[PDB]
């Protein structure tokens, strides 16, 4: 073969980029991407808190670098939003001293670097934010486009401004959370990593963004055991998720959450399931059941009826190709990461067996 | 009470509809019996961009026709030279779930966004060989369904929140908003008169906007189901539209109505992307059928097919000079047909 130096350099860039991509391919394949769904009364937030207890510590130096660039981007975006607001406002808010209006220029110039936050920028923005008239401008602009937690970043800046500093992960998560649209509520069990993706701050229609999640290893459909009447709407949400052409191949875990709240509702005897579901009068606790000690059989009959209603929908269509896996839980259950893991394993195994034709 | 407004709206809508029917003196398919059909179009996968990592969701050509961006829900925005198949850049993303990307008309910048409602802009003319976010043009309330650059300081974005929005990039404060749709908005296309951009609703309709006017000049509606993709005919006078209804449709602005449907009873799969050849004479559509169909834009002949994908076609693009047709499937493979 023959190349110019230009082609060779681009080929070495291509191979350098390839080696980088091949390193990321290992991280990608090693992560079980795992869409989370559930009507917001279903406490899916409280479920991801039971994942975040396993995510106790900052993920790695490479993840920490990725959030340093985000901390710096929100430091820059919050102070430049103020720097243009103090130009756009009708008050001639050139500072108390001309040096801050000169250092404002070298902020706009010095923010343009595709490298680490140099000590000059930190030195400028603390001297700016020391003027209480900037805190008053932050309260004048309180409903304009600004990062609402900017007063955290510009106060913590003192600790940010020097090499090898680390923030605690709730400051990072708080920095990132806005009108976000998803949350990547990461966790790991037995050194298996789940990028669980919650969907939230996102509009009432599913049928287009669901066509992203077609490759997630499983869908966790969290659903509220206790808010029957609403339950029948979630049963249609599950029926829709299940039959949807672009999810045909992906297995659904169900969490029947708020079991205890249903149990107390059933112990209260309101038993509106009989009204909302006449089939309850015919249905009875199957001998499949393995209840907890001290359950009222009615509580078993309720939970297993509801569960069997989801399973009925799961059984009616497509179950030749994708399973669904019910679990009974409450937000206190530490075992939820282990429940997710066991049936994530099963979903992968019971997928391989389709292609090894053992099924 | 709304009734009088719903009767007024009905009457206006009826007048608009009836006036269209009056202007529909003939179909396009009538007068194009003057036209020799295209020779049945043959193409081969004269490249495959094998090295992508997960399913490619979107792509866009650079105006130089040489480079193209592609983005995938592995979270890599990968920039390919179509000539050498060199991965000239591969840019990691602040969260993986892209749904769209675009190339600045200069080639200076690239953009993408997705279910994380954040748009981001990147500068390829780095000072130091590292590409990073120039600005994070956040502020939508739904997923950013499609981006296009008007200019290296102006970008329009669709959303699931029903709003198209134009951003002055340097300001980054939602510099115009075009709220008039219902449901999501799937896809955008810009005329060479970049003042005009069409956006496909996730209702049946398409709306034409003018960037300065800040509201829809027109609302085309011939489709039955969601418009998945949209593209101006190359002179800007007309635009194609794919739908989950499986039909392709061509609309002309001045006719304000459907000039030509493309369909077969064989083809139940929704169209997922559309674009024209440089002459406009070929309209290319990807499907849930992995085969692309190529249509004679004037004859409605299924003049050819591009079979060479093994999963849904996610996106399509024709170079500025019409030399070749990128197609991003839900395989990692981006195939450059020609």
């Amino acid at each position, epitope marked *: 073969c023959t190349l110019s130096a230009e082609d060779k350099a681009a080929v070495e860039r291509s191979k350098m980029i390839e080696k980088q991509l091949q390193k990321d391919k290992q991280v990608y394949r090693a992560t079980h991407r795992l869409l989370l769904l559930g009507a917001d009364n279903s406490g899916k937030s409280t479920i991801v808190k039971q994942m975040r207890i396993y995510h106790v510590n900052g993920y790695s130096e490479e993840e920490c670098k990725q959030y340093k660039a985000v901390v710096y981007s929100n430091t820059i975006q919050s102070i430049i939003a103020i720097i243009r607001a103090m130009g756009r406002l009708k008050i001639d808010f050139g500072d108390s001293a001309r040096a801050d209006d000169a250092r404002q220029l070298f902020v706009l110039a010095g923010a343009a670097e595709e490298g680490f936050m140099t000590a000059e920028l930190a030195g400028v923005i603390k001297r700016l934010w020391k003027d209480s008239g900037v805190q008053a401008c932050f309260n004048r602009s309180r409903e304009y486009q600004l990062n609402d937690s900017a007063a955290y970043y510009l106060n913590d800046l003192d600790r940010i401004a020097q090499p090898n500093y680390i923030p605690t992960q709730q400051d990072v998560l708080r920095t990132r959370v806005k009108t976000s649209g998803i949350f990547e509520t990461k966790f790991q069990v037995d050194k298996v990593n789940f990028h669980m993706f919650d969907v939230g701050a996102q509009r009432d229609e599913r049928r287009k963004w669901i066509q992203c999640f077609n490759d997630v290893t499983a869908i966790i459909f969290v659903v509220d055991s206790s808010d029957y009447n609403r339950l029948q*709407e979630a049963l249609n949400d599950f029926k829709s998720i299940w039959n949807n052409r672009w999810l045909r191949t992906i297995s659904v875990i169900l969490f029947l959450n708020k079991q205890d709240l249903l149990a107390e509702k059933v112990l209260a005897g309101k038993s509106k399931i009989e009204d909302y579901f*006449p089939e309850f009068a015919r249905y009875t606790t199957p001998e499949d059941a393995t209840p907890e000690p001290g359950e009222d059989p009615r509580v078993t009959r309720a939970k297993y009826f509801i569960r069997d209603e989801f399973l009925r929908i799961s059984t009616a269509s497509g179950d030749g190709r994708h399973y669904c896996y019910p679990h009974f839980t409450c937000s206190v259950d530490t075992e939820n990461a282990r429940r997710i893991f066991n049936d994530c394993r099963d979903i992968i195994q019971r997928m391989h067996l389709r292609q090894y034709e053992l099924l | 009470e709304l009734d009088q407004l719903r009767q007024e709206a009905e009457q206006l809508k009826n007048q608009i509809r009836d006036a269209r029917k009056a202007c529909a003196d003939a179909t396009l398919s009538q007068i194009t019996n003057n036209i020799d059909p295209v020779g049945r179009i043959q193409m081969r996968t004269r490249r495959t961009l094998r090295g992508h990592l997960a399913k490619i969701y979107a792509m866009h050509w650079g105006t130089d026709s040489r480079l193209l961006v592609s983005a995938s829900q592995d979270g890599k925005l990968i920039i390919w030279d179509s000539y050498t198949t060199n991965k000239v850049h591969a840019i990691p993303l602040r969260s993986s779930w892209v749904m769209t990307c675009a190339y600045a008309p200069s080639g200076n910048y690239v953009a993408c966004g997705g279910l994380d409602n954040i748009c981001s802009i990147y500068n390829l003319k780095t000072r130091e060989g590292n590409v990073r976010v120039s600005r994070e043009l956040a502020g939508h309330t739904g997923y950013l369904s499609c981006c296009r650059f008007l200019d290296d300081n102006q970008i329009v974005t669709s959303s699931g929140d029903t709003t198209c929005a134009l951003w002055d990039i340097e300001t980054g404060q939602q510099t115009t908003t075009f709220t008039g749709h219902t449901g999501d908005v799937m896809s955008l296309s810009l005329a060479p008169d970049t003042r005009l951009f069409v956006s496909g609703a996730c209702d049946a309709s398409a709306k034409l906007w003018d960037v300065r006017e800040g509201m829809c000049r027109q609302t085309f509606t011939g489709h039955e*189901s969601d418009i998945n993709a949209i593209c101006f005919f190359p002179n800007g006078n007309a635009f194609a539209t794919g739908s989950d209804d499986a039909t392709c449709r061509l609309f002309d602005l001045r006719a304000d109505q459907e000039l030509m449907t493309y369909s077969h009873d064989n083809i139940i799969c929704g169209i997922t992307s559309v674009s024209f050849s440089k002459s406009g004479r070929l309209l290319l559509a990807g499907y849930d059928d992995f085969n692309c169909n190529v249509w004679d834009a004037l004859k409605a002949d299924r003049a050819g097919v591009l079979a060479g994908h093994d999963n849904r076609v996610s996106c399509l693009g024709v170079t500025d000079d019409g030399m070749a047709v990128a197609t991003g499937s839900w395989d990692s493979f981006l195939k450059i047909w020609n």
Partner: nanobody
Amino acid sequence: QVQLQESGGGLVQPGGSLRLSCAASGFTFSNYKMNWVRQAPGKGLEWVSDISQSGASISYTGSVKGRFTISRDNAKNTLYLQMNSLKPEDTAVYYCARCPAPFTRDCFDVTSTTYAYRGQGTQVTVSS
């Protein structure tokens, strides 16, 4: 183009019976699964009933199994809802809702607020 109009609502006595109907236009109706969806006071958009393209596959919300019945005519491009043994809480705006896309089982979004392929609704009052 795509245009829907519900009909046959109004006041009716509790325990009474009534047929709603919907005329659908501007699309090939036989290709679509069809739904009735209701907005009572305080409730959200509850899915009430659905009918397949064939008219054969059918289901109902559990509080409406047997009490109502749904049917369609693929030639007349129309959807009917027979209602019987009406409970006062069945008082709602009833909407004819198409599933989003043709040849589907799927039927997402028919209960979503601001959804496209749903009519103007007909009010039904179950009261005396």
